[model samples]
Target: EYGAASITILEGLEAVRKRPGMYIGSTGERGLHHLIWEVVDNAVDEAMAGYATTVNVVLLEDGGVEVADDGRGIPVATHASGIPTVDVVMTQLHAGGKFDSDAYAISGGLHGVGVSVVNALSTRLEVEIKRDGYEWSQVYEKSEPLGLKQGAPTKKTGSTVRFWADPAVFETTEYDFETVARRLQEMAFLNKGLTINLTDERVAPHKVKSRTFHYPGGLVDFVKHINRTKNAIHSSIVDFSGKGTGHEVEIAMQWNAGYSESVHTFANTINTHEGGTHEEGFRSALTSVVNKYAKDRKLLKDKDPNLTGDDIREGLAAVISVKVSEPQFEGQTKTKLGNTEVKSFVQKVCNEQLTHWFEANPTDAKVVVNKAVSSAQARIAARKARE
Candidate 1:
């Protein structure tokens, strides 16, 4: 017999200070990287909330970093508890609007633990919010507010966060420009129609370097980027998209004339490298559909065996992106999705759309099927050659 009584409450901001690594993943370089990610996560949330389209990250000399986005700035009004909105959010953990839908419908910072953690870990943090035709500024040191200043502003509605990492708490204070650029590029690929820019001004005399990433075609462009080095058997890429059961899933695939299979999956803009049920369902349904089509059309020889998952996926590059209201992530890092229903939802969309694609584009279908057949034969021949 079990009673319904389970209550746990830990004090304010103590856990993060005691174990910063626990919330951010590490206290070394990775943790340092996590600090940047925390600020970027806010920008990403703005994009997810449909209020922003551009994000910029800058790595400055003197161990300072800046992140700016053209999204709805953080609220600057006084809270019901009689504290400034900025102070409440920066000083208190779990004080953001991610918990309440009134502020945001869908957000990446649902745990409400990104910016406050970054503020607590930094030596000096400054935030500028441009909204309602006025700009507001706040300065903080080690999560304690220094002062709030109202400033004159231009015609911009967004937020900018600039901080200097505390060398006392963090082993290293230097930032990697290349890492920041790479992450911004990845984010641009994930969020279609969004522009992400990164600049590094750390050289002597302040040399400026920048890159602007905009993907109009979204993950399709991402697939092309990944397949640039590979040789595709077919000239065209197979792309499919569908939405059902309040979820949207998009897939892009192409087979190269090589031997490795590369597949990437994402849920709600977060990469799922570990791969969950959606991946399994997609693979199973894809293999079965292709095998059935080949067998029915008599293209697969009687002596030739059916394609296995590995055989069919030889030199394959694919991207699977899913968007849903409620995502079930596996861990704090959120490297995987655990929703059992998403598997079937994605599988159904992929199966239906791909089957229809093959039917409509018979020539492309033949090309793909022939490529798989040849790949299977070559794999067997290679095994024999090795033996």
Candidate 2:
């Protein structure tokens, strides 16, 4: 009963192909799109860590995806742990450079699991690195190496990764242009001054057109883009970025004409739709800071307490993105941030910056106060109507 047949060892990278969903989430539409996001995120991570600038995402004619970056190329030399670091990186699981804070200050793909997971799930994966006046390349079929190619080079240095998702692992093989375009556009906006080039060439007859996204104003620009369809309460947006002990926070907010509020939060450039401590800190800080400003301006009487968070943030469009050296997550997917210190850190930084701005610019301060007062009043009227 206790023989070798009782245990089936899934060796090498075959584990990924056997259970693709466990790593990439699902093999449905979400996972199909994740194939590209994983690649794009790597290039974006390099940009976030200050090693790269431009990122290119191309849909090849043969239904493959290519992501190329102008960052420092992957090392092609032999290492002590694994064969020629590149091979270990492409073929091995839980192997990467992001673990060292010195190597990467902040990254979305922390466990060094992105590219390798891509390699494992891809039917065919190719890596090309040019650095140190030499160009090197390797090809893999289902995570199996197909020999390495070392070539002579002159100067240019970067990394190029091309892969095709395995048909057996995915529910659909088609990719939508708008889905890719919108994500690349978000990446460009999240990191200011970063340019993203995306081209769709999966078809035979194509136009000489490509989608390019580059935003200089950062999160403020993001607020503008999201609030484009709505009317604004104020002409200018409130934007600030600050650094604390081991974290960097950037926030932008603007009030629109509608009653609904929209707040987007991120940790290490990854979207946190469920929110976490940072969002809580932001909400609490806004309610306290703006209420204090309103009271100082004599807009509210002593009988009136601080405004509620819902009242303060009503009609607001805000984006809060925080990057930390080490992010503590609550769950398996890293969706919720569990760092308790981040709460006070975010609250202090946001309160300081917001209070400073409110004191410095009284005109904008009055507009923000008026909007919140109107919001509080409307909520009261609605409550009465409901009663």
Candidate 3:
């Protein structure tokens, strides 16, 4: 009884609203916040591409959120469909510069469906583009678009996106300023010299809450910030960056005086909590490198077995970030990177750079090895006691 009539195709953005939870997570506050993240991801993509330096977010008094970036704005030229390029990006799924490797070498929003998903869930979305020596603007109400309007001449270039979540679709449209601030802070830390600003304007103008995140040290600064409350075993952070075939890796690590490990991984500024090949590469290389250094320095006897990755990772604060040209995301939330090439790329970088770091920093290297050996000893003792 399966017939063509049974296949009710959803046109354009209709699929997004029909199964909104599939695009976003839910119709609750999380989904409302996801709307902001979708817009911010585009701005961050511009930053990652080296075309933007600043991302500004403002929580409007009218329950709308605005995200602005100082980068080459979305193209306004006519597309093959006789529609403006910007409109195509806003209305269509899987439409953006991210798919073209030349346009964005490394992007978190590789799915190319972020902005369009935002538009589908929004009651009203406004886009302002400042490029081509002038300013262009457009408005969309629930996928219904208004004609593009070119404004007066301007000597600026960037894009600003403002959107109000559809009340009928979402259970809550309220946004948490703290949540937004934390995400922007992490982005600024990962992007190094980039600056991110968050402003809440729901209250009086004089009482507005605003925060700016800027970290010139990048991952080095990130490790320091996370270990601020923890005691450090090493005075300096071991940090390095390497480039491979169509991919790049950056790692920063420090051993602290704590008993637990705190390691985080990111791919193009998106945190991969579930980890992936990059994390696997980092772990394997770290264990072997530390063991080699320990043996070369005679810190561990030949009779002692090599320290396990877990043993060496105790008290370690690390950040492993990689940028891949074509990232294949796989996992429950689609946050894990499934690029097999990235693993070896990261492994090669870690194996070479980390080996060099250990050799150059003998004193810190000894401290790291000693910590790992002690952790190994404690584990054996606990096992024996249980036996």
Q: Residue by residue across 71-118, what tens digits does model 1's lDDT show? A: 988888888969878888887876788775566655556667777878
Ranking by lDDT: 3, 2, 1
Which of the predicted structures, 1 or 2, would earn the higher TM-score when compared with the native?
2
Q: Stretches of candidate 2 above 4 Å error?
A: 1-10, 204-206, 294-306, 329-334
Query: Candidate 3 local accuracy as lDDT?
Result: 0.88
Best by lDDT: 3
lDDT scores in order = 0.80, 0.82, 0.88
Cα lDDT of model 2 by residue, 1-387, tens digit: 999889998876777778876677778877887878777877888888787889998988887999998877887788687578888888887787888687778887776667787888789998888887888889988788888788877488778999998888886878788989977887887888699999888769948548989999888889999899988878878889878888988899888887788898888877666789998888888888998888888777888766788888788899999998888754324567767888888898799989988888777778878988878877778999999
Q: Work out how many backbone clashes candidate 2 has.
A: 0
Which of the predicted structures, 1 or 2, would earn the higher lDDT when compared with the native? 2
User: Candidate 3, TM-score vs. the true structure?
Assistant: 0.92
What candidate 1 gets wrong by more than 4 Å, as runs, is 1-10, 100-102, 153-155, 168-173, 204-207, 299-306, 374-387
lDDT value for model 1: 0.80
| Residue 77 lDDT, candidate 2, scale 0-100 | 84
Residue pairs in candidate 1 whose N, alpha carbon or C atoms collide under 3 angstroms: none
Tens digits of per-residue lDDT, candidate 3, 1-387, equal: 899879998988998999987787688877788888889888998999999999999999989999999999998889887899999999998787887778887888877688898899888999999998989999997777898999989999999999998888987778899989878888998897689999999853555789989999899988998799999999979999989878889999999989898998888888786789999999989998999988887778899788999899999999998888878876213568778888888898899999998889878988988999889989999999999
Residue 240's lDDT within candidate 3 is: 93
Q: List the residue pairs that clash in candidate 2.
A: none
